[PDB]
Amino acid sequence: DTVTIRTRKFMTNRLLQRKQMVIDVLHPGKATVPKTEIREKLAKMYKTTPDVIFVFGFRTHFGGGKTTGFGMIYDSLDYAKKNEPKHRLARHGLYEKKKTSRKQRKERKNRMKKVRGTAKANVGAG
Amino acid sequence: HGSLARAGKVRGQTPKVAKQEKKKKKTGRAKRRMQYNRRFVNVVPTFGKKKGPNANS
Amino acid sequence: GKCRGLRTARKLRSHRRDHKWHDKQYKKAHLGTALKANPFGGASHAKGIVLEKVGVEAKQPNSAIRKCVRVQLIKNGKKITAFVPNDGCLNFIEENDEVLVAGFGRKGHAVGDIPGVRFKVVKVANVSLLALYKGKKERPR
Amino acid sequence: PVARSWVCRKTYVTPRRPFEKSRLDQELKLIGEYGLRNKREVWRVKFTLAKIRKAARELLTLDEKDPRRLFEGNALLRRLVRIGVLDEGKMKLDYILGLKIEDFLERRLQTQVFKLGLAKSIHHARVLIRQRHIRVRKQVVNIPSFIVRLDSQKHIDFSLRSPYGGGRPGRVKRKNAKKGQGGAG
RNA sequence: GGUGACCACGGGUGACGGGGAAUCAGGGUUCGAUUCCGGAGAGGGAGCCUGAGAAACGGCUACCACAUCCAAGGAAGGCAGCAGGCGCGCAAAUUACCCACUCCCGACCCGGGGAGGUAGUGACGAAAAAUAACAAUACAGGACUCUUUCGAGGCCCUGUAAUUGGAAUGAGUCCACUUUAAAUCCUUCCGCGAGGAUCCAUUGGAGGGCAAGUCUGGUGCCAGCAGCCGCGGUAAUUCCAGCUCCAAU
Numbered sequence: 001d002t003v004t005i006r007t008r009k010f011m012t013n014r015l016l017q018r019k020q021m022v023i024d025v026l027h028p029g030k031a032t033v034p035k036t037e038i039r040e041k042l043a044k045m046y047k048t049t050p051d052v053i054f055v056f057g058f059r060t061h062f063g064g065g066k067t068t069g070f071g072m073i074y075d076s077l078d079y080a081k082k083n084e085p086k087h088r089l090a091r092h093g094l095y096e097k098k099k100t101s102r103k104q105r106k107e108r109k110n111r112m113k114k115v116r117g118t119a120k121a122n123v124g125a126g
Numbered sequence: 127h128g129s130l131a132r133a134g135k136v137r138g139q140t141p142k143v144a145k146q147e148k149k150k151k152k153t154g155r156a157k158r159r160m161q162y163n164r165r166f167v168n169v170v171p172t173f174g175k176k177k178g179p180n181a182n183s
Numbered sequence: 184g185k186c187r188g189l190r191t192a193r194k195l196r197s198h199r200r201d202h203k204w205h206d207k208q209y210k211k212a213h214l215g216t217a218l219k220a221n222p223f224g225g226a227s228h229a230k231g232i233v234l235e236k237v238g239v240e241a242k243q244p245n246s247a248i249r250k251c252v253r254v255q256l257i258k259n260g261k262k263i264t265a266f267v268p269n270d271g272c273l274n275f276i277e278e279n280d281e282v283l284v285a286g287f288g289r290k291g292h293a294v295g296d297i298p299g300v301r302f303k304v305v306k307v308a309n310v311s312l313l314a315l316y317k318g319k320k321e322r323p324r
Numbered sequence: 325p326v327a328r329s330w331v332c333r334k335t336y337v338t339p340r341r342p343f344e345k346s347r348l349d350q351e352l353k354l355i356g357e358y359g360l361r362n363k364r365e366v367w368r369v370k371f372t373l374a375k376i377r378k379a380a381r382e383l384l385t386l387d388e389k390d391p392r393r394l395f396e397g398n399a400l401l402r403r404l405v406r407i408g409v410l411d412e413g414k415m416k417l418d419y420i421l422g423l424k425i426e427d428f429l430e431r432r433l434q435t436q437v438f439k440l441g442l443a444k445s446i447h448h449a450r451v452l453i454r455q456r457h458i459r460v461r462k463q464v465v466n467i468p469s470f471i472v473r474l475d476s477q478k479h480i481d482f483s484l485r486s487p488y489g490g491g492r493p494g495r496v497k498r499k500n501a502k503k504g505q506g507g508a509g
Numbered sequence: 510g511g512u513g514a515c516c517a518c519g520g521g522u523g524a525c526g527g528g529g530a531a532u533c534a535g536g537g538u539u540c541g542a543u544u545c546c547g548g549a550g551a552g553g554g555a556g557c558c559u560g561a562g563a564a565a566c567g568g569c570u571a572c573c574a575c576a577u578c579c580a581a582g583g584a585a586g587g588c589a590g591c592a593g594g595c596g597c598g599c600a601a602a603u604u605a606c607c608c609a610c611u612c613c614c615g616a617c618c619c620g621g622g623g624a625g626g627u628a629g630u631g632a633c634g635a636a637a638a639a640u641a642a643c644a645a646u647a648c649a650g651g652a653c654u655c656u657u658u659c660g661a662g663g664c665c666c667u668g669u670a671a672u673u674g675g676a677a678u679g680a681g682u683c684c685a686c687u688u689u690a691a692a693u694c695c696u697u698c699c700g701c702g703a704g705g706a707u708c709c710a711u712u713g714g715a716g717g718g719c720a721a722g723u724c725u726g727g728u729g730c731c732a733g734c735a736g737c738c739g740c741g742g743u744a745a746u747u748c749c750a751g752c753u754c755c756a757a758u
């Protein structure tokens with residue numbers, strides 16, 4: 001009822017295949033807004049479905065009257081799975097990555113030099 | 127020379143006392159209100175030949 | 184009088200240069216001696232082992248026994264008397280116990296009475312006399 | 325190497341002649357007269373003014389009609405009128421010198437809470453401001469010692485989201501209400 | 510032949526060089542190993558390959574100086590990368606998470622980066638800033654007005670108390686959201702969360718310099734105090750204590 005999502009600084013990024021602007025969320029005593037609602041309420045806004053809108057940034061400031069941030073819009077999900085970084089697609093269940101976890105990589109890859117070129121042993125791995 | 131027996135003669139035999147308890151003293155900025163108030167605006171009576179802020183009667 | 188001239192920037196500099204090896208407060212600081220002499224090797228405090236407890240007799244006008252500690256510093260193996268400040272605290276310190284000895288405030292002068300004692304004890308077995316003589320932290324065991 | 329900031333510098337100076345009496349007996353008035361947090365908070369304003377006065381005095385040594393004086397001067401004067409100290413276009417510099425602490429105190433938020441009725445006793449003000457009761461313009465202000473721009477004097481007002489102002493009676497009245505509904509009723 | 514008291518040459522440095530710092534009426538004085546620039550060294554020297562580009566140390570060759578495994582024939586050693594430990598020491602952080610930011614190398618949009626960022630530790634230090642406010646009482650007072658004063662009307666006040674009283678809030682805790690990479694932290698907020706006996710401010714002082722008691726206990730040239738001046742020998746404004754106050758807080 002009381003949210004009123006007003007945008008600033010819209011740019012038609014021909015060359016990243018996008019529309020991109022500062023989201024300015026008003027909100028009264030009710031607390032923040034989640035990025036799901038904001039996507040669906042920004043979807044009917046520009047009429048592009050919620051699917052193709054990626055939002056980060058969002059920083060509230062005293063009183064809880066207002067919260068700024070950055071959201072943006074590709075002209076197809078096909079491009080979004082291309083121009084967009086991983087974290088923003090992985091933010092909602094569309095693209096995840098391996099959990100090897102950094103020191104498993106390092107401990108492995110500092111072996112496989114010890115072994116020569118016998119693939120079998122490099123596949124031996126950790 | 128000298129006898130080191132007498133180290134801590136005095137704290138030794140001074141009879142200890144309780145530290146009491148009344149008022150959790152007001153602090154911070156209210157302290158400073160209480161301060162000014164109690165020696166500027168309030169009492170400021172007919173002078174009695176200088177003060178004695180911690181002196182006796 | 185002074186030299187006063189206009190191409191006299193040296194006779195002046197070199198005048199005001201040497202007429203500092205007649206200052207006292209710089210010939211401590213810039214000569215060498217100090218760093219070489221003070222058991223505290225230019226260092227604010229220092230740690231050392233209590234090798235015995237010694238009463239010192241105060242300078243005539245004020246009679247009393249001062250209650251100090253012969254220390255041997257770790258870094259040098261240089262010995263020391265340090266007056267254990269505040270009443271009945273010598274009672275705390277036992278022999279062979281590791282103390283953090285700091286200065287007196289006169290930086291080299293012996294303080295007031297305590298004839299020829301530059302140093303004062305602070306800590307004792309990682310405690311601090313201030314905590315002991317207040318009864319906050321007990322003696323370790 | 326790292327990113328990060330530094331450039332941290334003090335906001336104040338402590339006095340030399342460390343307890344004159346006369347100096348204490350001034351600096352106390354100031355604390356009561358206007359309900360100040362502490363003593364330092366004076367020598368904040370004391371240090372800030374001494375900047376200005378030395379900035380001004382820096383200019384009074386220059387010849388007139390010289391690009392700096394005219395520029396830095398206006399800029400400096402404007403900055404004072406802007407916060408409501410020099411008035412009407414008093415704006416010609418020498419005057420800056422004749423100016424005392426009382427002023428950058430009178431234009432702290434705290435003072436301009438009861439100066440505009442709002443509070444009810446000077447310490448309410450400092451409480452009320454901390455308590456996130458009062459707002460300026462639209463931001464809810466937490467800070468007593470926010471020097472108020474002269475423009476933004478008429479927009480100090482009881483917050484939209486606070487008990488006096490409206491909405492959600494605070495938890496004390498909510499609990500002693502629920503004692504009447506739940507406990508009594 | 511060249512240099513020299515316009516101080517060479519010799520010695521020293523708690524000396525990597527600048528850019529700056531804190532101090533500061535003007536002038537200096539000391540510090541700058543300190544993230545920016547410039548130099549050097551990877552235990553120490555020398556020589557080396559290789560390389561455009563190195564005399565390259567996350568190469569090697571000895572030697573010297575160090576040090577590991579051993580089947581005793583031999584073999585592998587370089588934290589002044591990041592973490593960590595030991596020793597030294599007055600004196601200094603986690604075997605943390607990550608390429609998401611800035612950038613770099615590659616054959617390269619795609620990997621990697623202890624370069625770097627993010628957490629943790631962290632009174633090195635700087636900013637802001639709670640530790641209560643207010644009404645009515647009970648009073649304790651003091652400028653109008655009223656009273657010769659004693660008294661009273663009261664616009665003014667302020668002290669303590671009763672807390673009489675409810676109002677307001679945060680420290681916490683914790684639904685929820687954001688954040689971010691995932692958090693965390695911050696900002697947002699539902700829900701709980703202040704009557705002191707609590708949700709509890711300390712460190713030095715209280716002769717003077719120097720703001721603050723010839724208040725009260727005890728010791729009696731002892732203990733002890735005291736940066737200097739000094740106090741202590743039987744009423745200590747000075748020691749150890751109690752209560753009160755002061756400065757910053």
Ligand SMILES: [Mg+2]
Nearest residue numbers: 218521522523
């Ligand atoms: Mg040397």
Ligand SMILES: [Mg+2]
Nearest residue numbers: 552587588589
């Ligand atoms: Mg080494």
Ligand SMILES: [Mg+2]
Nearest residue numbers: 550551565566
């Ligand atoms: Mg090299």
Ligand SMILES: [Mg+2]
Nearest residue numbers: 551564565566
């Ligand atoms: Mg080499």
Ligand SMILES: [Mg+2]
Nearest residue numbers: 567587588590
């Ligand atoms: Mg290395």
Ligand SMILES: [Mg+2]
Nearest residue numbers: 599600601633
């Ligand atoms: Mg340190």
Ligand SMILES: [Mg+2]
Nearest residue numbers: 591623625626
């Ligand atoms: Mg790092």
Ligand SMILES: [Mg+2]
Nearest residue numbers: 632634635636
């Ligand atoms: Mg600080």
Ligand SMILES: [Mg+2]
Nearest residue numbers: 153640709710
């Ligand atoms: Mg507190």
Ligand SMILES: [Mg+2]
Nearest residue numbers: 716717718719
């Ligand atoms: Mg004094």
